[PDB]
Design a protein around this nucleic acid. Structure first.
Lengths: 46, 58, 173
RNA sequence: GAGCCGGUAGCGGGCGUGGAUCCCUGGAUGUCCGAAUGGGGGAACCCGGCCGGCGGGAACGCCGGUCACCGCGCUUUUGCGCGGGGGGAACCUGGGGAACUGAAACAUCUCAGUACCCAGAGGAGAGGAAAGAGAAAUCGACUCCCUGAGUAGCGGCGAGCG
RNA sequence: GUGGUUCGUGGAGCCAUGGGGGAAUCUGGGCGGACCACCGCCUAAGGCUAAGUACUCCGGGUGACCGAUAGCGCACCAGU
RNA sequence: CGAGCUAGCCCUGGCCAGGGUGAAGCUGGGGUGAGACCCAGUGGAGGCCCGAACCGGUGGGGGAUGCAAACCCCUCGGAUG
RNA sequence: CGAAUGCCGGCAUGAGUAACGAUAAAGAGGGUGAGAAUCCCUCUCGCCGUAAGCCCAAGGGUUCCUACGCAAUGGUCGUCAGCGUAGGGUUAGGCGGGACCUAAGGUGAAGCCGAAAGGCGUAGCCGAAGGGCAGCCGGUUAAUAUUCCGGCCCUUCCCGCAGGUGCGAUGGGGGGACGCUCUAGGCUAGGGGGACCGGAGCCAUGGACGAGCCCGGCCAGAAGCGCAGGGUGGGAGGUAGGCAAAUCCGCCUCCCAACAAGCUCUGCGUGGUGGGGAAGCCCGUACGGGUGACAACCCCCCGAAGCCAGGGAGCCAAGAAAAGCCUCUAAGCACAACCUGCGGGAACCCGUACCGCAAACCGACACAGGUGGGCGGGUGCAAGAGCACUCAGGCGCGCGGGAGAACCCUCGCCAAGGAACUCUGCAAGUUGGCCCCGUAACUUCGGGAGAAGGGGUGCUCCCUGGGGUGAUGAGCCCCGGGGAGCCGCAGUGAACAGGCUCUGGCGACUGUUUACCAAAAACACAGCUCUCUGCGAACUCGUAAGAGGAGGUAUAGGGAGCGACGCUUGCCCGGUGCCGGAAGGUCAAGGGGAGGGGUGCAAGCCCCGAACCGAAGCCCCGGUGAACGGCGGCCGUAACUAUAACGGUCCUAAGGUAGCGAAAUUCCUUGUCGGGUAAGUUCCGACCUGCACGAAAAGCGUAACGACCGGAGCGCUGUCUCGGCGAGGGACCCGGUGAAAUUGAACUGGCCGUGAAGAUGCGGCCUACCCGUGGCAGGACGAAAAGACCCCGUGGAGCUUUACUGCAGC
RNA sequence: GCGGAUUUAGCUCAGUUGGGAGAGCGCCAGACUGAAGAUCUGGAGGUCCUGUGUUCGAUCCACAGAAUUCGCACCA
């Protein structure tokens, strides 16, 4: 029933990810956003 | 698709009555044949083995 | 196979013998691999005729030897050309497939008259160039596309139409 | 100033009045990522030159150290030696810069130069000694409070703004 | 042809500019809101300038502030 | 903020058990110049036929606080494009 | 603070009724436990088996073993776990990723354009089970293994010396490289029969000890080597000289230009090992086997959908970028460079355990969903991963006993009739395999054909033919063949397998598409038509830059109504878009002077400024329809009766042409005739007063084709005259487990009436004991959802034109 | 039942001071012909729908009421 969640390492890591996030304005942005804003870790960390 | 699901709470009281008709009755039991103890009317037991025949153990 | 090759000779004197029939899959153009003096070759412009029998070229000089080229300068009035070079050497400037090509239908000053294949008439400039004769498109039209859609086969855009879509949709539609 | 091996109480073993635990400041280390900048890259991982000890190399041969991105001047020479950047809750200024909503509609308009996004300086930036003010021939940085005025007035002179 | 300004194109200026014209260096040149005469005012078209107001990550105090469904949502192996 | 939804477009591999039909082709035989063109043999093209993996999901049947937020059953189409 | 279908949190409801997650089944014996249907061994039996197989990977990620242990998870248990605690378990120069190569695509010093963040982007980098690349089989623990052991085969890099030679870039060359469909040659997989060899034992039973049952009779290897193809050609010179630099290779010429020699996979092999099952004396004789006979190790068979091989053939829509190899600079060797030998040395970074057509992967659960590759064992079947049964290996679905009622589910049965049920033959039956016999109207002659219509088959004996079988001589296979015969209701025995027919509508047709309703006459289309474009094109994104277009170039690219083909597309540009005209009117900014005006002592200094000139536009003149679009009215007449042959007109742009007509465009209508039927408002055929068809949004037709839709007939059958009976599933009783919405509350009758007007609880009256479970639906205006049909709020969002205003681009 | 417009000499049509009315076609006489027809000559002919009403007077102006033809008509 092809849900949507099938995790494709290659991909998930790929399409998102530290690096990626830095890569752009937005990315970095909300990146610090959280950083400070609440702790946590981050995408790829996951 | 709940066409009909109770319409009113059920009355504590009555509810319980419903339950009411329901009565527990301990198994009729009778004392042994000779393994002298009380037993399940009609049967050998971890007391007996008899009846008229030594079939059982312990 | 998914590639191009030539479209403008400009190192002349070099014998160009019509190598061979490599009728070609990429721009309605059959072409021949051309074999030049030095061994240096060129999958070159179809121009119908000039048989397998390698045999011509073109150049500074002339040799209205059908097929072959030169400026419109070195060019006979009443001649069918293609290799249609508009501005002073921008490769060929027209008639690809385009059987009927352009006609030196009169030329004046550093400007020469082209009956413009595509369907009109006007001029190019001086030493500009062109090669004449035929294209080589064999009617290169019709053909059936019977039970299936040759199109789709086309690999070439089953970019299918629409225009009546139940919509709001696309650019002048 | 005399107890301590942190929140774990426990075990097993120990340090100290020949000023211990700990309070302070000023120290060396400071793995790998993150401006990351030596190179690559799904960070935190995998790749390169010299010095480096010489290392087992038991009758056989290393890590460690180190080291170089790029925009910046310019002593240009062959360019050597400087500054940058990456942050930051909210504050500042400049770049850019909106609908709802009010006008009981809604095109002016108001919401506002508001929200937001941006670049950037700071610890505060803003700004800041006059082609000003105003007119009593009078005043003299720039800013910020009160006051001036909700006046002078802007305006489908309508909401409101001021 | 736009901006700021209280100015919503207006009797409507000052400064700032987009695009074309393209001055004068002290009897120069703007200015006082159309403009004109006289007066009054300033001297542009470069730069620096601590302090007087803002702000709260952090430290302190204090509260007719709170009491765990109220206080920051989180008083403690919570932005987990 | 999202094409590991999905529809698309690019690049690059994998895949279609069986079986049927039988054109262009060429081989030879056919009264005429040659030839048309016939016939026969060979031949093995088709988004071609029958049918499964594969792909799909009308038609009836079940389910309806379901195995499940679309499924199970009978049935049905494509099946070298 | 009842009180906001309130938020938070407890807590009761139905309710001990509903459910246990696929009707692929269980039962017995013993074992262990505190206690076991639910754990362990064991013997009956059922289910897979093309999978319920094992495997590669993806994903998850310690879930794995081993000793412990069960509180919750495990929809019952539970001494069992993929539960808990703890210990322990995954090693590679040659497996794989990298340490190499590049297209897409991303990055990207330089370069290009932005208001700033940015864009785009060379080359170089990144970027793959696409390229590339040096071994395999036995063994061996609780666990890992192509990595541990061992046997056997290698690889690169280094020092040396030996023999060797213009070595020496990567720049050059060739070079690695390719579609699809098909098919010759030859070879292990793999499978098959051997009574042929080895062994552990049987027969029981009527019988057979005998070509009898039964187990197997390989797997791996340096090279040497004959089955075997696999990829090239040789030398000289010229080299107007290129591939920017010269020998390469490219191009011309004269000579060997073969079944030649050259260089990369299969057999033999075999070195030599391993294994090898059945053992098997210690030893558990049993959670059986870990560990010793000894194995036999032979022949003929059949043969691949990818193995050689980059085949070979045919075809169009005509099949990727960087190692290695030769050619060479810079260069440096050139008694020390490359190639080649042998000997010593050296060889890393991350990866495995188990799951893994799945309770360990996505679905929030051990949810009959899905999820990419590898032969997929055999017997029967014309062939085949289809079918029925099984092999190896897997499983018994995680709740079990027990009755057998309605009534739902799934499934089998019928006599006689045999759609009439009904909207509808919906469904479900008929039919269903291969061979022969036969084959209709129509035809775009291919095909409608499987059409339709018959008859066939089972095993035995008898004689005859043939293709692989090294001649051919146990050995295999396609095949008849004809003859005689046997037995059953039955002889594709069961399992997998079309009902046809006639006819009409539309659309051609195969398609695609509305994920969880609708595959359709809808879009797609092969095809046709007007058509805009000359390239730095026309249009589409873009703030410039740019990319797109197209490395396309008018047989081309973009707009587009129709959508094979056949026949044919007619009448009107007066409005309109548009194509063209551009002389004339008009009109923005602009240019340009009369004038007026304020202040001015005066020069001067500021506006207003208009005759005249001045842009697209629009007006007007034309063209223009496969461009929007439009294509009349009633009075009369032969018509013994009716439009009409003709005729009177009034308005427009002309005022339906050819085919067709009650169609799905005809409400009056079941229009009237016809046929079909016992009757037919559906059909199908004609008429045609066509409420309101018409050629291009085609029109009339059209074979084939359609999960399309309607209209007929033979076949068949419980659809239907009602059916009735039966089989397996819940329901019901048992024990274990033990939700859920709606709900003020409640010990809640019928009546006739009544109230807001369709009343259990108001009135008068009549039955009426207290409780419950299996049931049947009627009422409790039942549940579910603060109507989506409505109207209302100077509510919202999509789209439309000659609505307003504007912005874009022209 | 609602709307718009129309009812004139036999037929199709025209007029907004309203002031006092034909256009073409039909019909009888005159020709032209041997004849008829087409064709020149003359003519004859109207409640401007029924009834009202405002009006000096209006069929051309108004109000009902006949027939005309046209539009209309949905929501579930």
């Amino acid at each position: 029933m092809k849900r949507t969640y099938q995790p494709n390492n290659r991909k998930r890591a790929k399409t998102h990810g530290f690096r990626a996030r830095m890569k752009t304005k937005s990315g970095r942005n909300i990146l610090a956003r959280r950083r400070a804003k609440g702790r946590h870790q981050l995408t790829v960390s996951d | 698709a709940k066409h009909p699901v109770p319409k009113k709470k059920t009355s504590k009281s009555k509810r319980d009555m419903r339950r009411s008709h329901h009565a527990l009755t301990a198994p009729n039991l009778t004392e042994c044949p000779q393994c002298h103890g009380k037993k399940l009317s009609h049967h050998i037991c971890p007391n007996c083995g008899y009846y008229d025949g030594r079939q059982v153990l312990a | 196979q998914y590639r191009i090759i030539d479209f403008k000779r400009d190192k002349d004197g070099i014998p160009g013998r019509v190598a061979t029939i490599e009728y070609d899959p990429n721009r309605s153009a059959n072409i021949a691999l051309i074999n030049y003096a030095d061994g240096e070759k060129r999958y070159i412009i179809a121009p119908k005729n000039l048989k397998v029998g390698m045999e011509i070229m073109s150049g500074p000089d002339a040799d209205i030897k059908i097929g072959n080229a030169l400026p419109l300068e070195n060019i006979p009035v009443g001649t069918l050309v293609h290799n249609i070079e508009l501005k002073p050497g921008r490769g060929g400037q027209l008639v690809r497939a385009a059987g009927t090509s352009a006609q030196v239908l009169g030329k004046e000053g550093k400007y020469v008259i082209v009956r413009l294949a595509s369907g009109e008439v006007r001029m190019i400039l001086g030493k500009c160039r062109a090669t004449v004769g035929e294209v080589g498109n064999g009617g290169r039209t019709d053909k059936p596309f019977v039970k299936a859609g040759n199109k789709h086969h086309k690999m070439k855009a089953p970019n299918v139409r629409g225009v009546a879509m139940n919509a709001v949709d696309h650019p002048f539609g």
